Amino acid sequence: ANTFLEEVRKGNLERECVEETCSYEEAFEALESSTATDVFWAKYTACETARTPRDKLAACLEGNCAEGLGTNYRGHVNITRSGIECQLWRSRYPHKPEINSTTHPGADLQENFCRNPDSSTTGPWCYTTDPTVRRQECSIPVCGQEQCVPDRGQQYQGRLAVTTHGLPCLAWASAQAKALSKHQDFNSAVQLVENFCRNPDGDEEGVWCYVAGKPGDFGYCDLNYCEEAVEEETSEYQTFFNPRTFGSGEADCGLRPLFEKKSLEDKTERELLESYIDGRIVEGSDAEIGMSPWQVMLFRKSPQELLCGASLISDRWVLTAAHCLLYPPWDKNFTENDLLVRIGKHSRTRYERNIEKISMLEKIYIHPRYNWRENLDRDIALMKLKKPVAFSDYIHPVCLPDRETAASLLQAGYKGRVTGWGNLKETWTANVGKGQPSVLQVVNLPIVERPVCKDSTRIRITDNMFCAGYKPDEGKRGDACEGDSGGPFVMKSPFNNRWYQMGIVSWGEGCDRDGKYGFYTHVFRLKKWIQKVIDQFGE
Ligand SMILES: *[C@@H]1O[C@H](CO)[C@@H](O)[C@H](O)[C@H]1NC(C)=O
Ligand SMILES: *[C@@H]1O[C@H](CO)[C@@H](O)[C@H](O)[C@H]1NC(C)=O
Ligand SMILES: *[C@@H]1O[C@H](CO)[C@@H](O)[C@H](O)[C@H]1NC(C)=O
Ligand SMILES: [Ca+2]
Ligand SMILES: [Ca+2]
Ligand SMILES: [Ca+2]
Ligand SMILES: [Ca+2]
Ligand SMILES: [Ca+2]
Structure with missing residues (x-):
């Protein structure tokens, strides 16, 4: 740096080029030789992907x-x-x-x-x-693996220009990223510099940047975010997404057509309000008709086969898990034409032709920072259907919560609901008890403390997963492996009677040893991702 005076003083590499970033001649004055060198301007310029304190550079440069x-x-x-x-x-x-x-x-x-x-x-x-x-x-x-970038890096100033998937962030700059992606505007505190990863629209999943390919393409750059768990953190419903790309269904989600619209209460939804009371332990049962109307099946074309659960968030859009669509370990690479959604079924087999609609998908978005090589991290997938699905008493979408709202819920609810035709036991174990269930079952489960679920596993829980199930004992026994792969885990709010999806069923370690829990992928993080993926449309 050159704050006015101080150039009476002899050059100092540390004070000037290490404590402050710098220029060529400041470097030279400090240096004894004009070795503008090679891996020494690179001692600098390969070290630019680092820019935090006195150390991150000294650590880098030495x-x-x-x-x-x-x-x-x-x-x-x-x-x-x-x-x-x-x-x-x-x-x-x-x-x-x-x-x-x-x-x-x-x-x-x-x-x-x-x-x-x-x-x-x-x-x-x-x-x-x-x-x-x-x-x-x-x-x-x-x-500085010991550094911890916080607040999903709203503050972040440094200069990464490629994503997890290693693509080059286009500069916010462009005639399309600025002057044709002007349609969406941002938080102006966050200085967008060239093409360095930023988190303008306050996304919860970390920093990102536009990329090449389709218009509005993009991805999230790799940074080592702090462990900011929501579980350690309104009067009614205000709508979040643009209903030209979402489809309608939003401003009226989570209010069930044959219940919350009829002032009727479902058979175990009392258990959910009364979340504190040391309940008897209610097991799974054939759900009522139209009790979970955001329910989606994901059917493989030939042969006929039920792969996963999923959920409906609008007329167009269907939410599930990444591992459901893509899994190199089971040599799994399904695509838009292999797949059909059966929206709002009740039986596992019968064709409810009065009732359920079946659909083809118009494009399948696997999640950007999804990775399995380690451990099914960010096991998320989004799918758009080839035509809006018309609602009724059998089909009607769910509400996706922001963080502030999921934050609210976990403060008040201490149980949620898991439904499906038990596809998780079907995919991930031999299912050697009584066979697959004949109807869409329903059960309620307790949410576990973050620490409990953390030190209840040799595996590791990011601030993006969560656990469910009573803790196994001689009458307080535990079947954890409940629900459908890629399904919903919902909670009902006592502020607007609406049903939110809190999580997405993933693989549970609690599918093997009697003693574990079901792991779930928090859906509060997702909004802004979904926010960008929809916006890549107009029609
Ligand atoms: C270094 O390896 C190359 C690669 O084939 C080899 O041919 C060469 O002998 C080595 N260089 C020198 C200068 O001996
Ligand atoms: C590597 O070499 C250094 C030379 O001093 C030695 O201290 C260290 O023990 C060696 N380790 C291995 C695995 O060779
Ligand atoms: C799966 O298959 C498609 C179509 O044949 C191909 O383009 C692609 O390489 C594969 N996708 C992934 C994500 O592995
Ligand atoms: Ca200075
Ligand atoms: Ca100076
Ligand atoms: Ca100087
Ligand atoms: Ca200084
Ligand atoms: Ca100088």
């Missing part, structure tokens, strides 16, 4: 942590991801290198320290003494 997929690295991790001894760069046993210390003399390729000369999208790596293993990535702790 090559101790990896920058993004960091060809900045110059540490001493002589080992692999598994833990194989690293082969010396200078060697040819067991593997004769293609990339010696001349091909890539920019990079610090000496001894046997993990480096990233060629830039692996897996980053810093090394040659392996395990002669069957040529190269392999190395487990380096990354820069």
Whole structure:
């Protein structure tokens, strides 16, 4: 920096180029030689994907942590991801290198320290003494992994320009991103710089940016968000989405046609208001007619087959889980023409031709930051139907809550509802008890404390999942594996009688050991994502 005076003083790399960002000549004054160097303007410019405090740069510049997929690295991790001894760069046993210390003399390729000369999208790596293993990535702790970007990075100032899926964020700049995506406008506190990831429209799922492909395409860039759980956080219903791309159905969701419109109460909906009382433990039962009218089935074309549950949020749009449509482990890649939704069925098999409508989908949006390789993180999917579905007493959409509203609910409700034809037991276990159920069952379950559900699992719970089910005991027993894969978990509000979907059934560890819970994907986060995916329309 150059705050007026201070140029009487001799250059300081730390004060000036490390404590503050900088320019070429400030650098020079400080430097003794005009080595505008290579991997040293890169000691700077590969370190730009870092920009937080005195340290994140010093840590980066003194090559101790990896920058993004960091060809900045110059540490001493002589080992692999598994833990194989690293082969010396200078060697040819067991593997004769293609990339010696001349091909890539920019990079610090000496001894046997993990480096990233060629830039692996897996980053810093090394040659392996395990002669069957040529190269392999190395487990380096990354820069200020201990930092925690907060508030989904509303504040975020730094400069990432590619997404999780590694695409280049187009600059907000453009004649379409600005002057043809002007249609939607933002929070003007958030400085949009070129094409660096930002969170203008206050999205709950993190930062993002427009991308190439279809107009309004986009994705969420990778950043290490703080653990901000809603569970640790109106008089009636005001509408959220634009009803030209959502379809109508919104301003009138969650009020059931054959109940909340008839001032009639359903057989276990009392249990839900009276959420505090140490209830007896009510099991599943054949639901009433038109009790969950946002219910959706997801039918595979040939052969006939019931894949998953899903839910209806409007005339057009149908919500389910990502893993339902796409799962490389079961070699699963379904597409818009393989799939049919049966909206508002009651039997598992019969064709309720007076009643249910069946539909083709006009495009299937798998969720942007969905990933299974680790652990079904962000297991979410959105589908638009080839024509608005006409409502009635059997079909009628649900309400998707903001955070503030889901926040409200969990404060007051301590139970929710899970319905389906028990497809989760069907997909994910051998289902060796009594067979699949004959009708759309219904049950109510308790929500568990975030900590309980956290230390109730070897697995890990992001601030984006949640758990349900009574905690197994000798009469306080536990069947957890309830509901449909990719289905709804709803709660009813005692402020507007409306039914919100709180979660999306995912895979439960509580499908194996008697002692676990059903895991659910919080739907409060989703709005703005949905907000962008709809807006990519007009008709
Ligand atoms: C890597 O080499 C250094 C050389 O001092 C040594 O301290 C370290 O123990 C070595 N580790 C392995 C796995 O070879
Ligand atoms: C470095 O490896 C290349 C790759 O084939 C090899 O041909 C060459 O002999 C090596 N470079 C030098 C300068 O010896
Ligand atoms: C699944 O198949 C489609 C159509 O053949 C293909 O374009 C695509 O590569 C696959 N999609 C994914 C997400 O793997
Ligand atoms: Ca200064
Ligand atoms: Ca200065
Ligand atoms: Ca200076
Ligand atoms: Ca200063
Ligand atoms: Ca100067």
